Scaffold this active site. Structure first.
Site, PDB file in Angstrom:
ATOM      1  N   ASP A  43      41.141  56.834  32.967  1.00  0.00           N
ATOM      2  CA  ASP A  43      41.167  56.668  34.417  1.00  0.00           C
ATOM      3  C   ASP A  43      40.021  55.780  34.878  1.00  0.00           C
ATOM      4  O   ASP A  43      38.856  56.066  34.605  1.00  0.00           O
ATOM      5  CB  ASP A  43      41.045  58.033  35.100  1.00  0.00           C
ATOM      6  CG  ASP A  43      41.186  57.942  36.602  1.00  0.00           C
ATOM      7  OD1 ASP A  43      42.332  58.041  37.103  1.00  0.00           O
ATOM      8  OD2 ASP A  43      40.160  57.748  37.286  1.00  0.00           O
ATOM      9  N   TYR A  48      34.647  50.625  40.226  1.00  0.00           N
ATOM     10  CA  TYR A  48      33.684  51.038  39.200  1.00  0.00           C
ATOM     11  C   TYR A  48      33.074  49.839  38.483  1.00  0.00           C
ATOM     12  O   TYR A  48      32.025  49.953  37.849  1.00  0.00           O
ATOM     13  CB  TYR A  48      34.335  51.928  38.135  1.00  0.00           C
ATOM     14  CG  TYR A  48      34.996  53.191  38.635  1.00  0.00           C
ATOM     15  CD1 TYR A  48      34.641  53.761  39.857  1.00  0.00           C
ATOM     16  CD2 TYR A  48      35.981  53.820  37.875  1.00  0.00           C
ATOM     17  CE1 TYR A  48      35.261  54.926  40.314  1.00  0.00           C
ATOM     18  CE2 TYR A  48      36.603  54.980  38.317  1.00  0.00           C
ATOM     19  CZ  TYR A  48      36.243  55.525  39.539  1.00  0.00           C
ATOM     20  OH  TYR A  48      36.905  56.646  39.986  1.00  0.00           O
ATOM     21  N   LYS A  77      42.737  52.151  40.280  1.00  0.00           N
ATOM     22  CA  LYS A  77      42.867  52.343  41.718  1.00  0.00           C
ATOM     23  C   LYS A  77      42.407  51.163  42.555  1.00  0.00           C
ATOM     24  O   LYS A  77      41.426  50.490  42.219  1.00  0.00           O
ATOM     25  CB  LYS A  77      42.064  53.580  42.127  1.00  0.00           C
ATOM     26  CG  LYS A  77      42.151  54.748  41.158  1.00  0.00           C
ATOM     27  CD  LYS A  77      41.365  55.946  41.679  1.00  0.00           C
ATOM     28  CE  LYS A  77      41.109  56.966  40.579  1.00  0.00           C
ATOM     29  NZ  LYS A  77      40.150  56.423  39.561  1.00  0.00           N
ATOM     30  N   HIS A 110      42.793  54.235  46.197  1.00  0.00           N
ATOM     31  CA  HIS A 110      41.580  55.030  45.970  1.00  0.00           C
ATOM     32  C   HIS A 110      41.205  55.866  47.184  1.00  0.00           C
ATOM     33  O   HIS A 110      40.598  56.928  47.059  1.00  0.00           O
ATOM     34  CB  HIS A 110      40.420  54.099  45.615  1.00  0.00           C
ATOM     35  CG  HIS A 110      39.376  54.712  44.737  1.00  0.00           C
ATOM     36  ND1 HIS A 110      39.024  56.043  44.801  1.00  0.00           N
ATOM     37  CD2 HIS A 110      38.565  54.153  43.807  1.00  0.00           C
ATOM     38  CE1 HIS A 110      38.040  56.279  43.949  1.00  0.00           C
ATOM     39  NE2 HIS A 110      37.744  55.148  43.333  1.00  0.00           N
TER      40      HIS A 110
END
Length: 312
Positions: A43, A48, A77, A110
């Site tokens: 994931d 990120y 996401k 997200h």
């Protein structure tokens, strides 16, 4: 591979590696360790900034013959600026380029709230408009399944009412000390799979170390991991408190995403398939009635689509 069947037939592994707490360098080692241990779901998220590293990790795994693409379930996401009108496809294609993949198994919004590039301005794009873009990328074959994260029940209902591709998954904060009974029941009613993040709850220990680096004895901290019932069940089952918390979420009917990045913890979190919790066990663990949201996502405060507006 233990999996949950999504409403469109896609099988999603019940346990995956959560990478929100991993840097590009740490994630490569984490991904390879997890996959070699048995994990079949990774994931990630565009925000990120570790998708490129994950792509490299997957590439190495394939070349080593550890697994084949079809055996891995990759979730990513779209961030707030990618949720804006006409921006989703571009965002997904960029994530695919970094991941070095032709498609992702699951693509999630997200958040439900759109923002501009530096998040200095709110973009009042209704969740209905956001979902239409997800329907489009799904139909284009760029994502084998689509869903949302940090959305409330009303927002999901508004998306479902459109009569387009159903929401296949909802990823939210879920752990013993924040059960989300209402959300899970809502999702079950609409055949929406639920994925729990922050499954291990809040920090369970406080470590003491001398300047020299000498480690002293740790002390317990108020948390899910230190719950009396959790500790009692861990002792009885000869499992660790963390494994009990993960099994709790699994038996609640959710998929889980432990964030651990340390090799030993990644291996520890995977050892939760040699036992199961009964309804009685679950009820006992929930007796403390402790419930408090740890991830407020307060940057959404004031946004017309703030999912937690009522809690501000």
């Amino acid at each position: 591979t233990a999996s949950i069947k999504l409403s469109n037939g896609v099988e999603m592994p019940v346990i995956g590696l959560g990478t929100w707490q991993s840097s590009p360098a740490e994630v490569i080692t984490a991904v390879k360790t997890a996959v070699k241990a048995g994990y079949r779901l990774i994931d990630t998220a565009s925000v990120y900034q570790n998708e490129e590293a994950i792509g490299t990790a997957i590439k190495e795994l394939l070349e080593e013959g550890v697994v084949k693409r079809e055996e891995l379930f990759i979730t990513t996401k779209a961030w707030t600026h990618e949720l804006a009108p006409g921006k989703l496809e571009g965002g997904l294609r960029e994530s695919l380029k970094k991941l070095q993949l032709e498609y992702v198994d699951l693509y999630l919004a997200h958040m439900p709230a759109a923002f501009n590039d530096d998040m200095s301005e709110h973009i009042a794009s209704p969740v209905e408009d956001v979902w239409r873009q997800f329907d489009a990328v799904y139909k284009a074959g760029l994502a084998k399944a689509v869903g949302v994260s940090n959305w409330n029940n009303d927002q999901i209902s508004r998306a479902l009412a459109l009569g387009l591709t159903p929401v296949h998954n909802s990823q939210v904060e879920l752990h013993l000390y924040f059960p989300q009974h209402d959300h899970v029941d809502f999702c079950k009613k609409h055949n929406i799979s639920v994925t729990s993040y922050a499954t291990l709850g809040s920090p369970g220990r406080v470590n003491f170390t001398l300047p020299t680096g000498q480690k002293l004895d740790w002390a317990p901290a108020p948390s899910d991991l230190q719950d009396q019932n959790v500790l009692a069940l861990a002792e009885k089952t000869h499992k660790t408190p963390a494994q009990v918390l993960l099994r709790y979420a699994l038996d609640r009917g959710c998929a889980i995403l432990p964030k651990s990045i340390q090799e030993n913890r990644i291996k520890e979190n995977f050892e939760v398939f040699d036992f199961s919790l009964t309804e009685e066990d679950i009820a006992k663990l929930e007796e403390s009635k402790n419930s408090q949201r740890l991830f407020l996502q307060d940057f959404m405060t004031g946004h017309p689509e703030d999912a937690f507006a009522a809690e501000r």
